[PDB]
Design a protein around this ligand. Sequence first.
Ligand SMILES: *[C@@H]1O[C@H](CO)[C@@H](O[C@@H]2O[C@H](CO)[C@@H](O)[C@H](O)[C@H]2NC(C)=O)[C@H](O)[C@H]1NC(C)=O
Ligand SMILES: *[C@@H]1O[C@H](CO)[C@@H](O[C@@H]2O[C@H](CO)[C@@H](O)[C@H](O)[C@H]2NC(C)=O)[C@H](O)[C@H]1NC(C)=O
Ligand SMILES: *[C@@H]1O[C@H](CO)[C@@H](O[C@@H]2O[C@H](CO)[C@@H](O)[C@H](O)[C@H]2NC(C)=O)[C@H](O)[C@H]1NC(C)=O
Ligand SMILES: *[C@@H]1O[C@H](CO)[C@@H](O[C@@H]2O[C@H](CO)[C@@H](O)[C@H](O)[C@H]2NC(C)=O)[C@H](O)[C@H]1NC(C)=O
Ligand code: NAG
Ligand code: NAG
Ligand code: NAG
Ligand code: NAG
Ligand code: NAG
Ligand code: NAG
Ligand code: NAG
Ligand code: NAG
Ligand code: NAG
Lengths: 211, 384, 420, 148, 49
Amino acid sequence: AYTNSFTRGVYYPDKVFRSSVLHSTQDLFLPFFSNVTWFHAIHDNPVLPFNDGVYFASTEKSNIIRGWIFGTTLDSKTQSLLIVNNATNVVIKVCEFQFCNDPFLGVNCTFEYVSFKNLREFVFKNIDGYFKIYSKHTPINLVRDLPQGFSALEPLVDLPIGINITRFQTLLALHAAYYVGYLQPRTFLLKYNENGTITDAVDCALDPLSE
Amino acid sequence: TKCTLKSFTVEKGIYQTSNFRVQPTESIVRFPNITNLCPFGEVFNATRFASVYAWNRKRISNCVADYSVLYNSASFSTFKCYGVSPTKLNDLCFTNVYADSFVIRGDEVRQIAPGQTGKIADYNYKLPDDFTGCVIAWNSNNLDSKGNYNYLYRKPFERDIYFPLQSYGFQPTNVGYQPYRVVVLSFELLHAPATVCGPKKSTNLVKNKCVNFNFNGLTGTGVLTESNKKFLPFQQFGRDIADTTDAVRDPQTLEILDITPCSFGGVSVITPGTNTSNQVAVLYQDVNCTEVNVFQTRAGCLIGAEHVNNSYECDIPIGAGICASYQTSQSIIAYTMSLGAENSVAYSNNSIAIPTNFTISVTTEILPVSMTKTSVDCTMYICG
Amino acid sequence: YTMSLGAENSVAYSNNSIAIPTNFTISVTTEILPVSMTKTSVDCTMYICGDSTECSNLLLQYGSFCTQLNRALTGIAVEQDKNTQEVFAQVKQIYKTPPIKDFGGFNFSQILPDPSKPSKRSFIEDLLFNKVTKFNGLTVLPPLLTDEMIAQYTSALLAGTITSGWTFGAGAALQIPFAMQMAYRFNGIGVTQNVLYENQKLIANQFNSAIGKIQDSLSSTASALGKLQDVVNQNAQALNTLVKQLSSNFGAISSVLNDILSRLDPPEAEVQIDRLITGRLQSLQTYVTQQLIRAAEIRASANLAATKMSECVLGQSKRVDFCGKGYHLMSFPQSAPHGVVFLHVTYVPAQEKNFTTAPAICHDGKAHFPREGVFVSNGTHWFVTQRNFYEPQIITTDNTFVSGNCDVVIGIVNNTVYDP
Amino acid sequence: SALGKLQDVVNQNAQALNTLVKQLSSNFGAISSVLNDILSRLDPPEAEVQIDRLITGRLQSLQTYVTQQLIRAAEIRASANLAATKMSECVLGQSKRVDFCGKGYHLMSFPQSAPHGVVFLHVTYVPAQEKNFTTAPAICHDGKAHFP
Amino acid sequence: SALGKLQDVVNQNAQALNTLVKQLSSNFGAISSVLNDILSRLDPPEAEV
Ligand SMILES: *[C@@H]1O[C@H](CO)[C@@H](O[C@@H]2O[C@H](CO)[C@@H](O)[C@H](O)[C@H]2NC(C)=O)[C@H](O)[C@H]1NC(C)=O
Ligand SMILES: *[C@@H]1O[C@H](CO)[C@@H](O[C@@H]2O[C@H](CO)[C@@H](O)[C@H](O)[C@H]2NC(C)=O)[C@H](O)[C@H]1NC(C)=O
Ligand SMILES: *[C@@H]1O[C@H](CO)[C@@H](O[C@@H]2O[C@H](CO)[C@@H](O)[C@H](O)[C@H]2NC(C)=O)[C@H](O)[C@H]1NC(C)=O
Ligand SMILES: *[C@@H]1O[C@H](CO)[C@@H](O[C@@H]2O[C@H](CO)[C@@H](O)[C@H](O)[C@H]2NC(C)=O)[C@H](O)[C@H]1NC(C)=O
Ligand SMILES: *[C@@H]1O[C@H](CO)[C@@H](O)[C@H](O)[C@H]1NC(C)=O
Ligand SMILES: *[C@@H]1O[C@H](CO)[C@@H](O)[C@H](O)[C@H]1NC(C)=O
Ligand SMILES: *[C@@H]1O[C@H](CO)[C@@H](O)[C@H](O)[C@H]1NC(C)=O
Ligand SMILES: *[C@@H]1O[C@H](CO)[C@@H](O)[C@H](O)[C@H]1NC(C)=O
Ligand SMILES: *[C@@H]1O[C@H](CO)[C@@H](O)[C@H](O)[C@H]1NC(C)=O
Ligand SMILES: *[C@@H]1O[C@H](CO)[C@@H](O)[C@H](O)[C@H]1NC(C)=O
Ligand SMILES: *[C@@H]1O[C@H](CO)[C@@H](O)[C@H](O)[C@H]1NC(C)=O
Ligand SMILES: *[C@@H]1O[C@H](CO)[C@@H](O)[C@H](O)[C@H]1NC(C)=O
Ligand SMILES: *[C@@H]1O[C@H](CO)[C@@H](O)[C@H](O)[C@H]1NC(C)=O
């Protein structure tokens, strides 16, 4: 099952404030109007390749999707970044955790940190061993597919894990469909408003008009 | 004016000679107030270093790095820095520091450098061609030598965990084959939250005054004011179109400061010919009469010229309708240029004016027709 | 599609047929000419090496590159004021219109200055001004003549024209009724002044309607102001490119001179600063060369505008299409941002009729030729009429002159020449 | 100061040549501005680098000079065309164009040679002394309008 | 030769294009005028120079 990414997947590329200016950047973005593999959480969590970066989005009504797993083997044989959001605590671990055959939650550690109606988007990528997470929480009223609109993603987490990542997996809390994209080194023209919020973007390789 | 014209006689007119520039009063140095000392001790005084095939990469962050003791220490056989100068490490400071500790044979030290190739620079440890940091090596023939066969050799910064793996024997009787403890300090200079900064004391910040600032190694001169720009929590620096820094966040107090360059502008000297007088009037272009017989014009601040209500024909143009001249006791005067005498025409619907006379007038018009036919021998000019 | 060159129009030509207009229309056209451009000045030392003693000392090794660029930009800036002065200051006195606007039915309140404004500019001038719109050593010098002074010069030219014809441009201003001035102009285009003195009301109404249509065009079309806005756009793009060139590396480790200085000792700080200096100096030289090339063009346009002012406003031009399509009557200058706008009032024939013509006429064996105008026939009777307006008159010995005999002229016809 | 642009051209050309000559004393980063001094002090491997710096600097200076000369030559060509037009339409004939041949009504012109230029003596007719009169567009004699 | 400046413009433009094309064969101090030859013989550290 596929769907259209529309204009989703736009995030702030650097940590420099700009206002009322059109800035062109060369960074791993999600292509506009691309196909994002669609999965269901009804009545479905393969291990997905990581490639060069991942765009992850989900629509939630009861907080079913709460965690992610990153690694290469995911069987305690190699360091695996693990994120869990239980109750009101955000937990991140890098331990070589031993994973089950079908890992899900019921309803040499070198780092550790402990802190439809909702659309949650996430971006995961590794550059030079740096694990960055960009996210944006916005309310929606739609269940069929990802809503159409533009909303930039800001970074919240920057981990120097240094892990070689090739595959990842999603954690489901079983007693919310999710979409997975991929990033490419595409050229974008970002429109910063007066307040410095990226309100519009142009995908330079989308069509001759955008060219 | 005389020096600018390369002449001892100055013709009548207005000349642009120098540039006015406000100077800073005091210097501001600002760093996060972290008293932790960076654990270079556990890296440089470690009991045993790892092998070159599996060199250890230690993260150094959230501490003060004193590079002066390392530089002055005489135990070091070589200390080569490629990205930054060793004497600037105390002022400059970095987001993160990587220290790669491993042991290299005597002849292979030269291979640990950007742009180098060989059996070491390409196989068991590769450095980027744009590497920014320092390579530190000292002899360890009195600590690591035995035979010591625990050290083995086999993309940049790659840890590669008839075999392609070989080992050498370390003996005290082997210089070019003796064990060298070589550690590579790698720095990242991306503009980001800084956690490793040198032992320089911060000072109090002064606002609304031309100061020479220093924010986490980002230096410059300007006036610091409170700004209403909403930096996001991950944002540290602001930038303008010309890539220069426009706003900063104080690392000690989470507030945003607007940086505006200190006042500057061209300086124009309005003078009659030195054949007539040595008195001059100075125009400070496009500045107010604050940072500099003071007359304020739209062309700048005019000093030395007396403003006069009477309007005359323009003699020495200034700008925005103001002209200057040398007029009576004599001095330089400033006035608005006169476009000519007003002449109302006695028009009516049945009146005509007809000339009863005439005059023959001969005028002169000069037109360039040609210029000098120069020719330059390019070969002889460049390489005579 | 293939573009069309225009509608095809076959001309009904024959050896004895002539078409003469019986009516006319007064048309006012608008021509916009750039006169000057922005007087920019770039501090080369501050642009290349802003507040850096080491960079300035290294730049001193390049000789007089900085000073010659400054010299070229100063020359351009002075030439701009020269262009404006040449175009507008062609009147030796500041004339002003009489307080009573009795111009025989011609309404000039549209282009005369409006006293109620804070700046005495006409309504069309305000329309023109409302349609056309850093810290790195790049400064903009103000023009010598303010917009108020330009408006005063244009008002003086307009008042002198309206009240004195071409006499103020020739010598001292000589007052003349505007109806008589228009009769002068009509005689200037080969149309008898009786035409004006008989159609004065119609001509005044046509002139007022044309001026109103100029209002409509200027208020409705943004693209009417063309090359004048194009110059502004080109200068803005040049400055933007020059500013953006400061962010380039040119091969250096960083585009920030302070960052290079704070990280490296002199031995290779000098190499990095040399790369930056080379890049920024090349950028400055490119900008200066482009500015000189464009300043030459603006100077040429300013010379054209001065020529048009002298030969079109201060006088009447016999040159075709130099002052708008048609037969030129008069022009009115208007100020525009860094330019001048001319309102060319021209005479255009409108309604034609076919007549049978003849090169000459035999009366007593002698060939009669028209003194002024041509012979026409309405089918039965022959008349002599002026070329640009149908006004037939009886063929008399006062209208024609005798030359030769009937046996030489080809196409001669028989008629009777009345003797008063 | 009567002769203006004509002397201005000479000044500009002389200043351009002076700047081009003075550019030979610059280093452009080389150890010495003297090519003979560089040659007599260094072996070819480094003399090549020093001479490369000097060549780059001097070649760029020549290009700047030539570009300035082309731009100025275009202006001089335009002025020469203006002078030819004035000669043809003002000396060889009588001009009806206003202010093309001096202020007033043009009568005749006389050409005079000038250093790298031409000087025109425009003889013009200028009305001097005026009087106010009462005018009328036409006159009735027998019901018919008479026009001059 | 009746057509003068008109043919002169064509000649000048052709000479300008010919000079621009011939400029591609110059070394400007590089080891070779062929960019592919430089790329196929050197690693990036001096291939960039
Ligand atoms: C010449 O053309 C003008 C048009 O501009 C004619 O004037 C019009 O006359 C009609 C009556 O026949 C009026 O209704 C219009 O209002 C007039 N127009 C204007 C602008 O005043 C004029 O009659 C024509 N003359 C001849 C001899 O044909
Ligand atoms: C010339 O035309 C202008 C229109 O631009 C006339 O001014 C208008 O006059 C009427 C009175 O009939 C007023 O109601 C308008 O407000 C005026 N408009 C403006 C813009 O002022 C002017 O009266 C005309 N001149 C003559 C002598 O009739
Ligand atoms: C050609 O013009 C003549 C002169 O105007 C015309 O002759 C007159 O015609 C009018 C009719 O409108 C009569 O009232 C006059 O008495 C005629 N006068 C003379 C002297 O003939 C003639 O009709 C015109 N012919 C054509 C074909 O237009
Ligand atoms: C104009 O009138 C003259 C007479 O005044 C005509 O001349 C006649 O020409 C014919 C043919 O050549 C001769 O047979 C006659 O003898 C001529 N008349 C006289 C009185 O000698 C002439 O043909 C007329 N032209 C036109 C075009 O009608
Ligand atoms: C996306 O998938 C649809 C099928 O649902 C297909 O028609 C379309 O070509 C695909 N687009 C891309 C870019 O893969
Ligand atoms: C910027 O933020 C302020 C909040 O004080 C808000 O009032 C304003 O509308 C915002 N402007 C834009 C362009 O979003
Ligand atoms: C290592 O120890 C020596 C003394 O044995 C000391 O002088 C040196 O400073 C230490 N290294 C560092 C990085 O401090
Ligand atoms: C600097 O000191 C102040 C107290 O004066 C403190 O609030 C602030 O957190 C310190 N900065 C850092 C980075 O800890
Ligand atoms: C100069 O500063 C004063 C305030 O002291 C201000 O009123 C004035 O507008 C300023 N003028 C200019 C040209 O900056
Ligand atoms: C001009 O005159 C006014 C009033 O007469 C006076 O206030 C003003 O100071 C005068 N200007 C100068 C420069 O003297
Ligand atoms: C004159 O006759 C031709 C014949 O075809 C006709 O086309 C033309 O319209 C006529 N002239 C006028 C003014 O009607
Ligand atoms: C004009 O041309 C016609 C042919 O259409 C011819 O019959 C007549 O004789 C010619 N007239 C003259 C004067 O050439
Ligand atoms: C004509 O009358 C006006 C009325 O003021 C006067 O100013 C003018 O001087 C008179 N003309 C001459 C030539 O004197």
